[PDB]
Amino acid sequence: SGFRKMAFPSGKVEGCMVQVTCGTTTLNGLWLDDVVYCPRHVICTSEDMLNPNYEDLLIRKSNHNFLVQAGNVQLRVIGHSMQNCVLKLKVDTANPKTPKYKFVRIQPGQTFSVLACYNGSPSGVYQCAMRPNFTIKGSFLNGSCGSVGFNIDYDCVSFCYMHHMELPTGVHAGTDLEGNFYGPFVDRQTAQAAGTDTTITVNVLAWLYAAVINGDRWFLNRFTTTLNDFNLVAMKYNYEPLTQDHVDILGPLSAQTGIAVLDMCASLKELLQNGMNGRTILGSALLEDEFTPFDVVRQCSGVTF
Amino acid sequence: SGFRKMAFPSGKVEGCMVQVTCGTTTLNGLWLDDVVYCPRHVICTSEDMLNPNYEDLLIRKSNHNFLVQAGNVQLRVIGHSMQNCVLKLKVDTANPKTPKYKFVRIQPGQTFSVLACYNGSPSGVYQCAMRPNFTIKGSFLNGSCGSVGFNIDYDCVSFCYMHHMELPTGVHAGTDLEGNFYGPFVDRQTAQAAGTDTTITVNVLAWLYAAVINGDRWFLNRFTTTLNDFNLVAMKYNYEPLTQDHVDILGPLSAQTGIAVLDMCASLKELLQNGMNGRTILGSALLEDEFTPFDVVRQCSGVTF
Numbered sequence: 001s002g003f004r005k006m007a008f009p010s011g012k013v014e015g016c017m018v019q020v021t022c023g024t025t026t027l028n029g030l031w032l033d034d035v036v037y038c039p040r041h042v043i044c045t046s047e048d049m050l051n052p053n054y055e056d057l058l059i060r061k062s063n064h065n066f067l068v069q070a071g072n073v074q075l076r077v078i079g080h081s082m083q084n085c086v087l088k089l090k091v092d093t094a095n096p097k098t099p100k101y102k103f104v105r106i107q108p109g110q111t112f113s114v115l116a117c118y119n120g121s122p123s124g125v126y127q128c129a130m131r132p133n134f135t136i137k138g139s140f141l142n143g144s145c146g147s148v149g150f151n152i153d154y155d156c157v158s159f160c161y162m163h164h165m166e167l168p169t170g171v172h173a174g175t176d177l178e179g180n181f182y183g184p185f186v187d188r189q190t191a192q193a194a195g196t197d198t199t200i201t202v203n204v205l206a207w208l209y210a211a212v213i214n215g216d217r218w219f220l221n222r223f224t225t226t227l228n229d230f231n232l233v234a235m236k237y238n239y240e241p242l243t244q245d246h247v248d249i250l251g252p253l254s255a256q257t258g259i260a261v262l263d264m265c266a267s268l269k270e271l272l273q274n275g276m277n278g279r280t281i282l283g284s285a286l287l288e289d290e291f292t293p294f295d296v297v298r299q300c301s302g303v304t305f
Numbered sequence: 306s307g308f309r310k311m312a313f314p315s316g317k318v319e320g321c322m323v324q325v326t327c328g329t330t331t332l333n334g335l336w337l338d339d340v341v342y343c344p345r346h347v348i349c350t351s352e353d354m355l356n357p358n359y360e361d362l363l364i365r366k367s368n369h370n371f372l373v374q375a376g377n378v379q380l381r382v383i384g385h386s387m388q389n390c391v392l393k394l395k396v397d398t399a400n401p402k403t404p405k406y407k408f409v410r411i412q413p414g415q416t417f418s419v420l421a422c423y424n425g426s427p428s429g430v431y432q433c434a435m436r437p438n439f440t441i442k443g444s445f446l447n448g449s450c451g452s453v454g455f456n457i458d459y460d461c462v463s464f465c466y467m468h469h470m471e472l473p474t475g476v477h478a479g480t481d482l483e484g485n486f487y488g489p490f491v492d493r494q495t496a497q498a499a500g501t502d503t504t505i506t507v508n509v510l511a512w513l514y515a516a517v518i519n520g521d522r523w524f525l526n527r528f529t530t531t532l533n534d535f536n537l538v539a540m541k542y543n544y545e546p547l548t549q550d551h552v553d554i555l556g557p558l559s560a561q562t563g564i565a566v567l568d569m570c571a572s573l574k575e576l577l578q579n580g581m582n583g584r585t586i587l588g589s590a591l592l593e594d595e596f597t598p599f600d601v602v603r604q605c606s607g608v609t610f
């Protein structure tokens with residue numbers, strides 16, 4: 001076929017989104033069993049987010065101060081607690097649409113689908129990678145907080161991300177579903193540095209394998225290299241160094257296409273220091289690093305759920 | 306925020322996908338009310354697709370020759386008919402998950418979401434434009450036929466596409482939900498020409514507006530132009546000519562950003578004949594034409610469903 005950035009089907013996550021209102025602040029919550037999960041800054045006014053003391057702010061809130069709405073039907077809140085940067089609301093009704101689910105903390109370079117939501121209603125779905133510097137390059141307007149990132153394994157939804165804020169550079173930051181931020185970020189309206197981002201080398205190689213499978217072969221060169229030699233050029237171009245663990249993850253793709261990983265590194269090497277000369281690869285004029293080796297295999301093998 | 310290629314949430318379409326088996330051929334069908342829709346080449350063997358006589362082939366088929374499966378539950382087929390290149394199977398049960406829906410035939414340049422499916426099970430979702438030459442640049446493996454393209458307006462699903470085949474260039478071709486192909490294509494395994502594709506000019510301009518809204522402004526130039534002058538360069542670069550209808554569609558974006566459409570054309574003009582000099586716009590080194598002016602407004606205004 002061809003190759004597109006593909007999100008997981010979002011139906012199972014759609015059935016879990018609700019609207020959470022505290023005071024005049026509304027955002028999105030995730031309703032699983034009899035618990036609703038949402039960012040704790042739902043309790044902040046505009047003035048509060050400059051420097052919030054979340055413990056002090058939450059003490060002024062009671063259960064009935066939290067309005068939780070799914071569709072035109074509301075849940076009754078019978079308990080609340082704050083875990084790290086997330087707030088957990090105990091409701092009197094278990095979500096009849098709860099899928100089989102898990103909470104996972106992903107690693108940098110891994111990918112996931114985002115269901116962007118407003119007022120508890122789904123708006124769109126897109127695919128994201130967790131950058132090495134633990135930001136994501138999303139698309140998020142005011143009110144999008146509480147939108148969640150997830151993967152699906154057959155029938156099981158692994159939630160890995162919930163959106164909390166945008167950085168000065170315009171990239172996005174958030175937490176796992178236990179409320180622990182990815183990266184060194186805090187939920188406060190203050191200027192925060194993400195630090196140098198780097199290109200996910202193993203993902204770029206997976207994509208070059210995807211290119212070969214789909215007929216794009218012009219970049220295949222006549223050289224080879226070593227891991228240390230390639231990593232010398234990786235460092236110069238802000239690419240993650242490649243390890244034997246990464247070569248092993250690329251192994252299935254190597255063995256299907258007959259191109260040794262160190263040969264694919266030599267092709268990438270020449271691309272890095274000679275550019276693309278105005279050509280394209282899989283329809284892009286840049287090297288794409290937001291497909292994992294697993295994503296490539298899924299798309300080229302037609303995995304279903 | 307930022308700007309990504311965004312698909313509609315797919316939950317409403319997920320509830321409509323089934324598996325259709327005739328003989329040893331299996332593909333995807335769309336179950337709406339008590340009718341299942343699927344490509345008519347479900348009735349073909351491998352040898353049949355070289356030169357099929359679909360009327361002759363279908364006459365040998367009875368209702369009970371069609372196996373329709375949703376999950377581990379099956380539908381009983383009580384009628385069949387062929388409309389253009391689609392087959393309609395009447396079943397004894399109306400889909401309890403049928404959304405409010407409509408069948409629409411889209412225009413070239415319009416966009417839609419694709420729910421790629423295998424064996425009746427959803428695999429992923431991505432966003433597509435109908436090219437001016439009536440192909441789509443999808444991602445489709447064997448067994449993906451019957452996967453459908455759609456848009457969503459609040460609660461109503463507009464089905465516009467169902468996948469039938471891949472072309473020699475690797476692009477994809479299919480029908481509306483009445484079985485009429487987009488483009489000059491036929492459902493036969495024979496070499497077919499799509500003809501010269503061209504770049505959707507109004508979509509490129511919408512994306513340049515999206516860039517300005519999201520902080521990318523370097524391409525804003527000091528020149529202007531006229532419609533005829535711009536179209537002279539559009540023709541040279543295989544861009545659709547721009548009409549007053551297109552300027553009018555761009556009007557809301559013009560009036561929000563304060564950039565006259567003819568000024569944005571002059572910037573695009575210089576980009577076309579001077580290139581991007583190795584810079585990027587919204588993270589791309591190419592001019593993107595698969596966002597409509599409506600898609601830009603939706604993403605920058607947070608439309609929900």
Ligand SMILES: *C(=N)[C@H](C[C@@H]1CCNC1=O)NC(=O)[C@H](CC(C)C)NC(=O)c1ccc(-c2ccc(OC)cc2)cc1
Nearest residue numbers: 041049140143144145164165166168187188189190191
């Ligand atoms: C959830 N509803 C929103 C989602 C964000 C809105 C716009 N795009 C988004 O991703 N979350 C919030 O508004 C956050 C609330 C706090 C309590 C975490 N805050 C922020 O998203 C935020 C924006 C900007 C800045 C910032 C940038 C630059 C400088 O100096 C140059 C200072 C501060 C901080 C926090």
Ligand SMILES: *C(=N)[C@H](C[C@@H]1CCNC1=O)NC(=O)[C@H](CC(C)C)NC(=O)c1ccc(-c2ccc(OC)cc2)cc1
Nearest residue numbers: 346354445448449450469470471473492493494495496
């Ligand atoms: C549905 N299950 C598939 C989806 C396609 C499979 C692989 N990628 C796809 O999009 N549909 C089919 O296989 C079609 C059945 C007929 C009856 C429409 N046929 C084709 O998809 C097809 C592939 C290739 C060619 C072809 C290409 C080049 C040349 O000469 C250079 C001749 C023929 C024709 C049809």
